[PDB]
């Protein structure tokens, strides 16, 4: 899943 301030997949 996407973590806005933390992680953006793909």
């Amino acid at each position, epitope marked *: 899943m996407s973590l806005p301030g933390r*992680w953006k997949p793909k």
Partner: single-chain antibody
Amino acid sequence: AEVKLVESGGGLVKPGGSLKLSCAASGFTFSRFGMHWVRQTPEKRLEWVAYISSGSSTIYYADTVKGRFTISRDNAKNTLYLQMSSLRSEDTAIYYCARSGGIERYDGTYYVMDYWGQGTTLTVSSGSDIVLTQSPASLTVSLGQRATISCRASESVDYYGKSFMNWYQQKPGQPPKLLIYAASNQGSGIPARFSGSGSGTDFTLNIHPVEEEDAATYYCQQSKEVPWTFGAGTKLEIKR
């Protein structure tokens, strides 16, 4: 080329008062980066304050500042703002503005506070967080020897095979500077003698060989869940 952040607007305020901070950004396309407010108490403890996405689609506040603080940005003016109200003595700190820098990998983008401003000073004249237990409290190492700082998170900071653990270095009079991101990856122009390792809940920062310029305070930080939380800090000194 040179990324810069200049916070301003501090000063003394009585309890219950209001104040507005500003940060002028230059050297990068401000509208394409999320931005942070991070404050440092006079006891040298770092507390994440607020975050805003590049497009202002996602907003996070620390539990200590909810309702009373408001983060905003004007991408046309390349400025970030922090409205403070109902100020209390616990809010007394130096407020840093930190850019959320995205580091692109093969499987996705990892976001970390990569650039910090000099900060503006604020002085008020009088549960489910991932707690990072940093060890040791301080360190005195001779030149060339090894310095080891450890971190235990209260719960796993792993998310889909990646460890969201970061390490920062802060010398007096300067903002924190990124050392290690993603548990073991080296920051921009960080010497290899700084080495991060670990996974899940246990992480370590090794400095070997320690040099004279390595005298500073080091903090671990997890970036898996909101709020961003910091370790208590470890002051590294050089034996004479």
